[PDB]
Amino acid sequence: AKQYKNLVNGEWKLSENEITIYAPATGEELGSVPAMTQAEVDAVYASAKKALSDWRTLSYVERAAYLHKAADILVRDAEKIGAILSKEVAKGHKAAVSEVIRTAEIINYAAEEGLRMEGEVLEGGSFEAASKKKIAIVRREPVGLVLAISPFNYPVNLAGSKIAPALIAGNVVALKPPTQGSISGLLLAEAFAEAGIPAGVFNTITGRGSVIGDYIVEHEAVNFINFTGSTPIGEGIGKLAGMRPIMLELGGKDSAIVLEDADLALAAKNIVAGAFGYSGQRSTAVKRVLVMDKVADQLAAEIKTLVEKLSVGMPEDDADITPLIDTSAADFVEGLIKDATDKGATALTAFNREGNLISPVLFDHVTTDMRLAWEEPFGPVLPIIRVTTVEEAIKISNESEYGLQASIFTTNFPKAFGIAEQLEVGTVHLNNKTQRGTDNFPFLGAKKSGAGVQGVKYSIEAMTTVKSVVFDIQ
Amino acid sequence: AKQYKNLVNGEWKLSENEITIYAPATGEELGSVPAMTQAEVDAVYASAKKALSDWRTLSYVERAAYLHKAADILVRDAEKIGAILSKEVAKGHKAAVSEVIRTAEIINYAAEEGLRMEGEVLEGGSFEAASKKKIAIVRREPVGLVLAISPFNYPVNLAGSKIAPALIAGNVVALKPPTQGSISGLLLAEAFAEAGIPAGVFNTITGRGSVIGDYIVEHEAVNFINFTGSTPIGEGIGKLAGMRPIMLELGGKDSAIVLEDADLALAAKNIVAGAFGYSGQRSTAVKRVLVMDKVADQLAAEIKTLVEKLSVGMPEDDADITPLIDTSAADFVEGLIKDATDKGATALTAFNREGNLISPVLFDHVTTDMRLAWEEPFGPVLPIIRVTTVEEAIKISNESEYGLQASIFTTNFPKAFGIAEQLEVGTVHLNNKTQRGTDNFPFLGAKKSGAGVQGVKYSIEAMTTVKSVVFDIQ
Amino acid sequence: AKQYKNLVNGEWKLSENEITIYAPATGEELGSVPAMTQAEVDAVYASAKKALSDWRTLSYVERAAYLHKAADILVRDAEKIGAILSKEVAKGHKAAVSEVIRTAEIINYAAEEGLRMEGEVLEGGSFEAASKKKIAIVRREPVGLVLAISPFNYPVNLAGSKIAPALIAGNVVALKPPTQGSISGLLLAEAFAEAGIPAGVFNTITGRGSVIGDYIVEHEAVNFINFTGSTPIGEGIGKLAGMRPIMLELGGKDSAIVLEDADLALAAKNIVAGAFGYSGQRSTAVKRVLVMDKVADQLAAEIKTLVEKLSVGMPEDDADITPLIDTSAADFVEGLIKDATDKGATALTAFNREGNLISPVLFDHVTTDMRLAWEEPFGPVLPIIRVTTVEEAIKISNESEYGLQASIFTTNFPKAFGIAEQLEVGTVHLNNKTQRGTDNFPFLGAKKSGAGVQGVKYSIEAMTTVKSVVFDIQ
Ligand SMILES: NC(=O)c1ccc[n+]([C@@H]2O[C@H](COP(=O)([O-])OP(=O)(O)OC[C@H]3O[C@@H](n4cnc5c(N)ncnc54)[C@H](OP(=O)(O)O)[C@@H]3O)[C@@H](O)[C@H]2O)c1
Ligand SMILES: NC(=O)c1ccc[n+]([C@@H]2O[C@H](COP(=O)([O-])OP(=O)(O)OC[C@H]3O[C@@H](n4cnc5c(N)ncnc54)[C@H](OP(=O)(O)O)[C@@H]3O)[C@@H](O)[C@H]2O)c1
Ligand SMILES: O=C[C@H](O)[C@H](O)COP(=O)(O)O
Secondary structure (H helix, E strand, O other): OEEOOEEEOOEEEOOOOEEEEEOOOOOOEEEEEEOOOHHHHHHHHHHHHHHHHHHHHOOHHHHHHHHHHHHHHHHHOHHHHHHHHHHHOOOOHHHHHHHHHHHHHHHHHHHHHHOOOOOEEEEHHHOOHHHOOEEEEEEEEEOOEEEEEOOOOOOOHHHHHHHHHHHHOOOEEEEEOOOOOHHHHHHHHHHHHHOOOOOOOEEEOOOOHHHHHHHHHHOOOOOEEEEEOOHHHHHHHHHHHOOOOEEEEOOOOEEEEEOOOOOHHHHHHHHHHHHHHHHHOOOOOEEEEEEEHHHHHHHHHHHHHHHOOOOEOOHHHOOOEOOOOOHHHHHHHHHHHHHHHHOOOEEOOOOOEEOOEEOOEEEEOOOOOOHHHOOOOOOOEEEEEEEOOHHHHHHHHHHOOEEOEEEEEOOOHHHHHHHHHHOOOOEEEEOOOOOOOOOOOOEOOEEOOEEOOEOHHHHHHHOEEEEEEEEEOO | OEEOOEEEOOEEEOOOOEEEEEOOOOOOEEEEEEOOOHHHHHHHHHHHHHHHHHHHHOOHHHHHHHHHHHHHHHHHOHHHHHHHHHHHOOOOHHHHHHHHHHHHHHHHHHHHHHHOOOEEEEEHHHOOHHHOOEEEEEEEEEOOEEEEEOOOOOOOHHHHHHHHHHHHOOOEEEEEOOOOOHHHHHHHHHHHHHOOOOOOOEEEOOOOHHHHHHHHHHOOOOOEEEEEOOHHHHHHHHHHHOOOOEEEEOOOOEEEEEOOOOOHHHHHHHHHHHHHHHHHOOOOOEEEEEEEHHHHHHHHHHHHHHHOOOOEOOHHHOOOEOOOOOHHHHHHHHHHHHHHHHOOOEEOOOOOEEOOEEOOEEEEOOOOOOHHHOOOOOOOEEEEEEEOOHHHHHHHHHHOOEEOEEEEEOOOHHHHHHHHHHOOOOEEEEOOOOOOOOOOOOEOOEEOOEEOOEOHHHHHHHOEEEEEEEEEOO | OEEOOEEEOOEEEOOOOEEEEEOOOOOOEEEEEEOOOHHHHHHHHHHHHHHHHHHHOOOHHHHHHHHHHHHHHHHHOHHHHHHHHHHHHOOOHHHHHHHHHHHHHHHHHHHHHHOOOOEEEEEHHHOOHHHOOEEEEEEEEEOOEEEEEOOOOOOOHHHHHHHHHHHHOOOEEEEEOOOOOHHHHHHHHHHHHHOOOOOOOEEEOOOOHHHHHHHHHHOOOOOEEEEEOOHHHHHHHHHHHOOOOEEEEOOOOEEEEEOOOOOHHHHHHHHHHHHHHHHHOOOOOEEEEEEEHHHHHHHHHHHHHHHHOOOEOOHHHOOOEOOOOOHHHHHHHHHHHHHHHHOOOEEOOOOOEEOOEEOOEEEEOOOOOOHHHOOOOOOOEEEEEEEOOHHHHHHHHHHOOEEOEEEEEOOOHHHHHHHHHHOOOOEEEEOOOOOOOOOOOOEOOEEOOEEOOEOHHHHHHHOEEEEEEEEEOO
């Protein structure tokens, strides 16, 4: 309906070519976003680097004021933005509004976290007596221009989680939203524009990653790449970054380890909520159940009953299971479902597909020779893998190339901590689904699941460097 | 002339083929080191990953005890090791012994720093009231297998500065010393072996980086690359690293900014010591003087007087200026000198070369069109560049692709801090030469000078990750 | 003139007796505050300890919301409150409004500082191998009921500087303002009540020292005493506190050391502003100049010219010099002036007194046998003491029983740092007047100038304790 524009050096810019966005659940035309050229990318980066000097010389309190204003505007327009976001990525209406609200919360928290940045004073006399009068005054500085790249499934939340930590520290930022999700990304940018963010301090880039993706990453003007998306794309970003710093939040295949002494009802509740939330289109979703044989039959039945209770419908109706982001995703999920069936897996809930609306499929008796045991579906399908020992569960869990998070369901917490030490993941939730929040907590993935540590204070630290001034007291 | 061996899984192994090492100053045959094959590299990494489990489960004090033992052995054998190191890299005998002692100091300091590793407890109620009973127990863990690569100019010191921080945190390590310097690196390995370091926890790799260099870095078994060397090789390591974390300490072109109110005698003393130490083969060396014109004539004269008193001779005689590491290095330095001369630079001290022993050359009236104004010589040649304003000095300093350190000589310390904020370097020393110490201080380079922050406590943090355990209080 | 009430368990209470409050500059009747009995104090403390359980179990975000709301209300009523504050303690009208604004900023900053207080996870294996599986989860908790006692010269700012840090951490608070200043304190309490602070979480106490003075401190319900006032009164509070924690902000006699290379005009500007602000009725004020004799004549002349131009008049006219707080204070200041004159000091500005309005008196050639060299006047009188060495200045400065802050005026900052290390004070300001701000900086006094460390984050730590939970991983 509307022709959207990029925020470039404090002004709204059209491009010669544009990309029409459609609602994945209905095909409704939502608008268009610019298809930037390489020359327009250069202008965005040139504007950012020119604004950096005056921006980093502002006080922390002044930079924090801008972020607070943008958060206030997001809360004001949460219904407006969430309504469009719901259509753009086929997310439940209420869930879409919640994302906008959560984004404002992260921006506010990042502003107050970052303005309290402190330095250190180190003593030369800690290392050698002859240097006892030498001290080091170590203060934090920005890294420069941060390229922020958000994913389709949380195009606003996982944009703000990068923009706010970067800006408070004195960096300038360019946001590359996902094409499917660029409208919501540009709506987020409108809030920062209305808040008065100085020209060039924050800008947006839109275009198909397959066309301009490598160019925006390879560009020498960029000092830092903060990316959330698929593991293959993250792999390429790692190569193109060279020796420049990066943060990557990539794929996940979070395991849920259920021991013999677990509250099976509580486990089934958390497993189903985490696995099928947003139709399973989340990196921190429960994506495989590793359950001890003794309790597998009872756990599978309780999970099944809850899966049968999930609603399947449209975003406007706040259905639990909504249509997937596009046809390719549904075809990929259907293939994984077909593979499990052909190899003897027991489908405890039935596969059905209407367009790209896939019903929630629960598989039992999944074996490691099935693709569904390892590949990230990003769809509403959950495998149950039976194990005989906790060592096997740890073994199978760590054999995955992914290591984002894991859940352990048990009443023996000392043992759970011991298991957690052996799991090659960033975060382990006890008797709870895997999840990124609360946003002050650390969020990181091991192995192919990412690089660097996020969460608010951790993001700020990652996107800063240090400047040491050393002198001798006389 | 001994046949030296690599430390592999608690055993000392020769290889089918070996590399003969010669003292660069005299041609004396010092011994041979193995020329490992790719399969032998695979065996090293396999051994390390197998030892990781038992090593990381030990207590901090147990791991610290091994490091203290190794440091004690280094101090005991400082003269023996220093004598060979002096010959192998043409470093002054006394300075070579000092390197070994400093290495023991770093190992001891890293052991006591790392054993005090602490985690953090985060409150869910800091972010949202509904999560006030949720807490995150965040503990530190090793990253896994660290590949340490040291340079020829400090093959023992800049090996220990990587090994000890990694080991205390629970990482396993493979050390790839420089070929010219590998004997010294294997002598360091002997100390760790005699200290009883468990088999596979620490290993060595030798071989020409031009044949196995890419292979040891690209190997998927490596979780972390900690490298010190040239910028082009560091640039390639960043690409081959992919998404994996790295630390790079690359080239330097440190500027010495001398203002009109400077103590010229103090500036000349620090500039000469820092520029010509080890014949200028140091990354943190003063490599260009940016001096206000008003004081340039007198500074240049006082620097000249000190340069003329530097001793030029052999490493065994503890000469200030020793022969460069190889003929190519000397040819490169002579090339830079010719470029400056042809373009009109004033040679305050004459260029003379006997073999690869180059006399110390001081140039005045160097211009930005000369290669010596920018390229890292790694030889005993120092340019003086006159400026008319401090702004110009800052601009010329930041025009360099390097940004390791900088010195400011002035009596106005508030203004010196303001200049320091604008310099694109890791560390700024006031009224003192640039230097890495004290080793507890942060050490880092901006732009093409590196990635990550070293210094003991910073090295430990860089080579650890975090493991978060989240649960709800009831 | 209205009859004011105490906030007690969410209700506003009069007492059978009251205390009428008059403007020190005019005798104007401003209103009355209750003269509480010991039994009414018991009710205040009982209500606070009754509310503690529900208050400390709220989330940090919930507690922060109350403080932010209260700060907003103070900004709204800054003109209303400041107008009364100006009359109550004879502070300049504009300065009084500024105090209210500064209080709001401190309340906001404390709220966001406190909600981010983090805990620690400690490793048993850091100390002994046998305990390597034992970890300590250390979290912050409030100390309980904090008694906050504010001073007459900052009855709102130095109340909020205690209330807000205490409340965010989960403490409950009882505010005892000074009698002269009690109205302004109760006006501050109205803001917290309007913000919805739960009943009993924050309360006020007013009354006569002859009835409740020692009683409010001795009461066993009080877990923490946070006091700003005179040193003798602080001494007594320490005794009555027993083993309970306290914070004391007492008197000062800040030295301003002026070296031969100092900018005398800048030094004179800062010395005069710091010494005569609010007629010198501040503990953190330049109260004695220690100047090298070579520059003393020129410095004294620069100070003299500035002192002569200070305005002397009424709070309503924003005069530089306003009437002192009461007659006894003015008599005490006159006595110090007479002693200095009788012992031979040179009066560079004339002494005049109308009522309790004393004109600013500058003395030169002050010797350390004069009372004015040591005793805190709390009036507009400044001595200049000439020295011949820096060592003499340090000795004379440290001979004082006070050690709050000090100023050093010089262009040699390395030397200034060396001097600062030897000065027995909390804070040393270089080329600037002594001052408490910025409020995130530490504020503390050595020797008889106080106990504990204030500034926002330091005040929160002081008014919290830790709770350690230790268990073994299995
Ligand atoms: N770990 C986490 O925190 C987290 C959170 C959310 C999602 N994810 C992961 O993200 C994936 C799903 O999201 P997605 O489908 O949007 O991922 P994607 O296809 O990798 O795209 C992610 C972002 O990268 C951009 N991009 C694509 N090609 C690029 C290139 N060559 N160079 C630079 N940027 C390029 C895309 O732009 P276009 O939209 O124009 O292609 C988009 O904005 C899943 O694997 C999921 O696990 C991870
Ligand atoms: N910033 C610092 O802390 C610091 C300190 C010292 C030196 N440096 C820098 O290091 C440079 C001089 O040292 P250098 O001559 O030893 O540097 P270099 O030629 O880059 O070699 C450094 C190390 O890398 C190895 N290497 C070579 N090719 C490799 C490859 N393709 N892949 C992986 N590793 C490879 C070398 O082994 P071989 O010997 O077998 O080639 C050696 O052990 C200067 O630029 C100096 O500024 C920096
Ligand atoms: O891609 C989705 C990520 O997992 C995201 O963090 C989901 O949000 P949550 O886990 O915080 O609920």
